[PDB]
Design a protein around this nucleic acid. Sequence first.
DNA 1: ATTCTGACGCT
Length: 425
Amino acid sequence: GPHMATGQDRVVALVDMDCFFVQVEQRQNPHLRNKPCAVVQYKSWKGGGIIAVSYEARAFGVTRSMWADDAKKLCPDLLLAQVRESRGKANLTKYREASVEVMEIMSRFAVIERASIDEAYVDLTSAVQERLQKLQGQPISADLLPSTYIEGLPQGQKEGMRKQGLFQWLDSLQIDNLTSPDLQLTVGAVIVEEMRAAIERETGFQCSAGISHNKVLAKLACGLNKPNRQTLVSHGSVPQLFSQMPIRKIRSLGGKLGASVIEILGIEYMGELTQFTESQLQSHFGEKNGSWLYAMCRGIEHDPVKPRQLPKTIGCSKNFPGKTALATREQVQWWLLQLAQELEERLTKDRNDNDRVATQLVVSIRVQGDKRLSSLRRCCALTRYDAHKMSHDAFTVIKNCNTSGTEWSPPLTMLFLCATKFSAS
DNA sequence: ATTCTGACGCT
Ligand SMILES: Nc1nc2c(ncn2[C@H]2C[C@H](O)[C@@H](COP(=O)(O)NP(=O)(O)OP(=O)(O)O)O2)c(=O)[nH]1
Ligand SMILES: [Mg+2]
Ligand SMILES: [Mg+2]
């Protein structure tokens, strides 16, 4: 009753760019705009692996993790843009720099947690208060929410339903109560519209947004109405929302843990978790997960918006599947050098931009036939931004995996250098 | 033979 907290204290938004790499390519090459198009890596093996698909191409069934040669079978007019290759590997620089454009705009409005290359979380709690005070009891007009969906509304053409649902919501709002959580989400949603307009005016990129009370619901909400739309998931929309929402759709339940929840408990949808006591959930899934499941299926999550705009690591990786696996000493050195040279270029730029230095170098490898994704992971000290030292140090730290009696055995199916443990500079 | 990352938990 009066003492059960409900997790309505914060306003949090999740903003995610629509088909991000495709839009980066469509801004640069106007011929790709408004066409079925995808972004690939490499081109020789089945036309390249697709990692970004425009919404026009998706109408034909083109998805991520698909080979371009297969996508062409579904979509014969599909236009492909290729990630830049450097030193024999894919080079994601253009998208990381495009991401920085976006993150810097978002950060003018509020503190953001960079959650991926194309998405950040936003804590709007303070911005909403400041804004609620400025409005001075003034009602909120649908004109301020031109692209907002209210989840679960209307109740009782797509743009027609959106406006109906928005009118119903706005009509019910108690505008004189500066502490009502629904009012705060609505105001949060006004700011997100502003944030999304500034991103498009200043980058040309379009995006979607989720507006709710915590990071997990904002993320879920963000996908309900992509593309170029934002969605407000209110505390009261949760029971209906979760009653048919598959467990796997919730961030962090998409894998094994969500599968064990499904299998142990004999359930399918998020809302079914509410029938289990916290202790029961803790008993099956641990004290942390259990507490987090007991609260999450009621729409409650306390994970904070971390004030972190920059990555914590900087990493370079290349897979070597199949017969291309590295089998010689010279080969493993040349690719450590290729990896280290990109890492160095990235690091020197990070130091100059962000006033910091990485202090630890992590080397990860895979050998052929090793079931695991990493056959080994070892760290050494990262004392100089010198590619030749880093690659040499990576070799020193993995050379005892070779079993050869100049040859390399087992052949390596993955090299991976990561710079970590940043310190101010 | 999607590949290339990046966060964060567990022990
Ligand atoms: N190298 C690599 N890049 C990837 C991979 N997956 C995605 N990317 C790249 C390409 C993606 O643009 C971006 C991740 O953004 P998302 O939210 O996952 N997808 P998007 O923005 O395309 O579509 P929408 O958000 O509208 O659903 O990173 C991958 O496995 N590998
Ligand atoms: Mg995206
Ligand atoms: Mg994303």
